[PDB]
Amino acid sequence: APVRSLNCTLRDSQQKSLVMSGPYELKALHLQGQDMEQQVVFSMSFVQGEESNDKIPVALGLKEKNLYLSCVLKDDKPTLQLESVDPKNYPKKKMEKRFVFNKIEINNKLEFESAQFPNWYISTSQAENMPVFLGGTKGGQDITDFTMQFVS
């Protein structure tokens, strides 16, 4: 059958919202009021992959855009990128592994681990106006847990 998807927003556990910071970067900042329209709306697709009660493979596309969050090596390091795809072919149920995150329930919140790079997570910084990135160090003040808000 088709792939199933939900529209949603994400905020980090410090309650920063995610906005596009150019065509291919996301940044996290504290947002409230009129400026909340700036936040990115995701289409979260429920994709093929290893699954358990608390760990659900997803892709994170930008709603109304042929753009997906993507985990690749860049200058020999696992990195988060926004990658363009052929809009005729996406979303699909068998997304390529660079596009897959394991959405994990953690202490009433959500973590997004790279399926491609075990124990690398979608991360934000403490400071505002910094990129969303793929973090692979568990020590430090980087934020790896989020809440989801459902969108019409």
Ligand X SMILES: Cn1cc(C(N)=O)c([C@@H]2CCCNC2)n1
Catalog residues that contact ligand X under the rule CB under 6 A.
38, 40-41, 62-65
Nearer residue to ligand X within complex by CB, 60 or 95: 60
Q: How far is the CB of 40 from ligand X (least distance, A)?
A: 4
Cα–Cα distance list, 52 to 55, 86, 114, 146 (Å): 5, 30, 16, 19
- Which residues in 2-39 are b (16+ Cβ under 10 Å) and which e? ebebeebbbbbbeebbbbbbeeeebbbbebeeeeeeeb
Q: How far is the CB of 140 from ligand X (least distance, A)?
A: 29
Q: How far is the CB of 100 from ligand X (least distance, A)?
A: 19
Nearer residue to ligand X within complex by CB, 16 or 78: 16
Nearer residue to ligand X within complex by CB, 40 or 59: 40
3-state secondary structure of 30: coil
Nearer residue to ligand X within complex by CB, 55 or 65: 65
Q: How far is the CB of 102 from ligand X (least distance, A)?
A: 22
For tokens 């660079």, name the residue. 98
